[PDB]
Design a binder for this molecule. Structure first.
Ligand SMILES: Nc1ccn([C@@H]2O[C@H](COP(=O)(O)OP(=O)(O)O)[C@@H](O)[C@H]2O)c(=O)n1
Ligand SMILES: Nc1ccn([C@@H]2O[C@H](COP(=O)(O)OP(=O)(O)O)[C@@H](O)[C@H]2O)c(=O)n1
Lengths: 325, 325
C-alpha cells in the first residue's frame, strides 16, 4: 500500500521531500513531469530518487502545458500563446476520450472523432451485466465496473459526432444513437489476384502474449502439424520446435503480402482467440481456426469472445492438449 | 491550423494512416503512446512519421494503463490486477488535479492532498476579474478564462481535504473553506548562525528566463554594480560582463549554504519580480530588491505581482535602463 506524489517543478520536488521526510514509515512513488531538464532539475530529482521507493522523470515535449505554475509576464503569455498549435479536429480511440480527457477540454472547439480501441469495442453494454461479471470483489466485477464507467464517459462527455469501426457487421459499443458509425476497412484484399488453392497449404499459429501459453502453443504446433509461429507484438518469449516468422509486419499485413506473392497457396491461421481472426476472416485463401485448450478453465476467455467468434463464422476447435506428449 | 491523432496500438496507427491518406490537403501531428516498443511498433510508427507533419512516440512505463484495447483473458485480468499498485493517498500540485484528473478518478478511494503550484497560487479569484483581464480576444482575457476554469475544477472535483502552502501570510487561491490550509516552510533559516553584517556585501542578480531580458539584465548588473548572476533554472542563455554562478542548487538553497559559511556577509539579491523574492524575504542577512525596467511596458507584469511584492515588504526600484550605456 503506497502513496503517490506528482511534481512538475523543482520547488514542488522540495515539497515532496518534506512530505516524505514527514512520513518515514510510509512508501512513496514519486513522478516528476517536466519540459526542462538540466543540472538543477536532475539534482533535485536525484535527491528524491534517494528517498522514494520508486521515482520516474517523464521528460515531456516542449509546450504541452498551456498553464503556468508561476505568474506569467506579457512575454511568457505571448510565447505560449503563439506556440500553442491551432487545432481544428482531434482523432482518438474511443477510450482515449477518458484518459486524454483533460487535454480535450483545453480544445473546447475542436471537432472530435473517434475510432475503435480494438476488439474491446465489440462487447456490448449489457454483456457487462452478465452473471459472469456479477459476483463481488472478484477481478471480473472490477473490470466490468470500470468499463461501464469508462464507456459512459467516452459516450457522454466530449461530444464527438462520428465513430470509425474496423469491424464490418458486428455491433459496436459506441453505436449509441449519439454519433455516426462509419466502417473504415484497414485491409485491401482486392488487387491480390488470389485464385484456386493448388500448390500447397501453409500453416501458421498466432503467438500468445501470455508467457504461460508456451507449452500449450508448442503442443498445438505439434498436434495440428503447424510449421510456423507468427509472434504477437506484445509477445516476448519464444517457442521451441516451431519456426518463428520474424517480420516487422503485423500478421494481416504479412499475410496480404504472401497471398499476392503466392496466389494459389492455402493459408491456415490457428489462434487462441486473437482479434486477428476477426480482421482476417474474409481474406481470400485464408482459413482461420480458434483453438480452445481443454486444460485451461472455461472462464479463461469471457463468454462474449465465444459468441463473437461463432457470430463471425470462425470454427472453434476443442483441443485436448493433455493428450499431446 | 492542424489536426491531432492519438494512438496507443499498431492497428490504431494503421487507422491514423487511413485518416491522413483521406485528408491529403490537411496537416497532422500524430502521437503514439505505448508501453511496448519493438521492431513491429517502430515500423508502423515510422510509416506515420513519413506522412505526418510531426510525430512523437511517448514510451510509457509498464502498467500505467489499467484498461484494455482488446478483450482480456483471465490471465490478462489477473496480471494487471496484481501489478496495479495499492494506493492509499496521492499528493499533487493544486492545478494537477485538472491535468492528472483522469488518473485520480481511477483511484476513487485514495485520499488526496495538494500543494502550491507556485506563485500562481497567490493571485486571488477576483483578481482574474480585473479590467486588466477583461478586454476581449486579448491574450490576457484567455489566460483569465483558463485559470478561472482550472481553479474551479481543482477546487470542486476530486475532494481533497488539505492544501500545503509554502508562503506564510499571503492568501491562497485554494483557501476556499472547503479544505485545511497548512503552512509547510521549505527552508530552514535557523542553525545558520547569522550575525551582524560586517566583512562585506555580495550582490547577485537573479537571471530571467526571457532571452529578451539579456540586455536589461546586463545593464542592471552594471548600474547597481552587481558582480554575480544566478541563472534561472528555466534560463538558457548567458550574460556578458557578469560572473555567472554555476551550481546545482536553486537560489534559496545556495544562499542558505553561503550564509552558514559566511555569517557576517550582507547578501543583496536583485530580481525582476521572481518568485524567489517571496520565498527569500525573511532569510537572515538577505536583502531583496525588485527591479522594474522603465523601458518595458507597465503591463509587462500583471497588477497582482506589484501588489504581492509590496504587500510582502519588498522594495520595487524603478530602473532607468535607457540611461545605462
Ligand atoms: N500473433 C499475432 C497476434 C496478433 N497480431 C495483431 O494483433 C492484433 C489484435 O490481437 P489481440 O486481440 O490478441 O490483442 P491485441 O493485439 O489487440 O493487443 C491483430 O489485429 C493483429 O494485427 C499479430 O500481428 N500477430
Ligand atoms: N534566478 C533564479 C530564479 C528563480 N529560481 C528558483 O525559481 C523559483 C521561482 O521563480 P519564478 O517565479 O521567476 O518562475 P518559476 O521559478 O516559478 O518557474 C524560485 O523559488 C527559485 O528557487 C532560482 O533558483 N534562480
Amino acid at each position: 500500500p503506497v502513496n503517490l506524489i506528482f511534481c512538475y517543478t523543482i520547488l514542488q520536488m522540495k515539497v515532496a521531500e518534506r512530505i516524505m521526510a514527514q512520513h518515514p514509515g510510509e512508501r512513496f512513488y514519486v513522478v516528476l513531469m517536466s519540459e526542462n531538464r538540466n543540472e538543477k532539475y536532475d539534482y533535485y530529482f536525484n535527491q528524491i530518487k534517494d528517498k522514494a521507493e520508486w521515482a520516474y522523470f517523464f521528460h515531456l515535449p516542449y509546450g504541452l502545458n498551456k498553464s503556468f505554475n508561476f505568474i506569467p509576464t506579457m512575454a511568457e503569455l505571448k510565447v505560449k500563446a503563439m506556440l500553442l498549435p491551432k487545432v481544428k479536429r482531434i482523432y482518438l480511440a474511443s477510450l482515449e476520450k477518458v484518459s486524454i480527457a483533460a487535454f480535450l477540454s483545453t480544445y473546447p472547439d475542436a471537432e472530435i472523432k473517434t475510432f475503435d480501441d480494438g476488439t474491446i469495442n465489440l462487447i456490448q453494454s449489457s454483456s457487462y451485466l452478465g452473471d459472469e461479471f456479477s459476483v463481488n470483489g472478484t477481478i471480473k466485477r472490477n473490470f466490468a465496473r470500470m468499463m461501464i464507467g469508462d464507456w459512459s464517459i467516452a459516450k457522454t462527455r466530449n461530444a464527438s459526432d462520428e465513430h470509425y469501426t474496423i469491424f464490418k457487421g458486428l455491433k459496436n459499443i459506441m453505436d449509441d444513437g449519439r454519433r455516426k458509425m462509419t466502417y473504415l476497412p484497414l485491409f485491401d484484399a482486392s488487387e491480390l489476384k488470389a485464385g484456386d488453392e493448388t500448390g500447397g497449404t501453409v500453416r501458421i499459429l498466432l503467438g500468445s502474449p501470455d508467457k504461460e501459453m508456451k507449452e500449450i502453443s508448442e503442443k498445438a504446433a505439434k498436434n495440428f502439424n503447424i510449421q510456423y509461429v507468427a509472434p504477437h507484438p506484445r509477445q516476448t518469449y519464444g517457442l521451441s520446435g516451431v519456426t518463428t516468422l520474424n517480420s516487422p509486419y503485423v500478421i494481416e499485413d504479412y499475410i496480404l503480402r504472401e497471398i499476392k506473392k503466392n496466389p494459389h497457396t492455402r493459408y491456415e491461421i490457428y489462434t487462441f482467440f486473437s482479434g486477428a481472426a476477426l480482421t482476417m476472416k474474409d481474406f481470400p485463401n485464408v482459413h482461420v481456426y480458434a483453438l480452445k485448450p481443454a486444460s485451461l478453465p472455461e472462464d479463461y476467455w469471457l463468454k462474449p469472445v465465444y459468441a463473437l467468434f461463432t457470430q463471425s463464422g470462425i470454427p472453434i476447435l476443442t483441443f485436448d492438449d493433455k493428450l499431446v506428449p
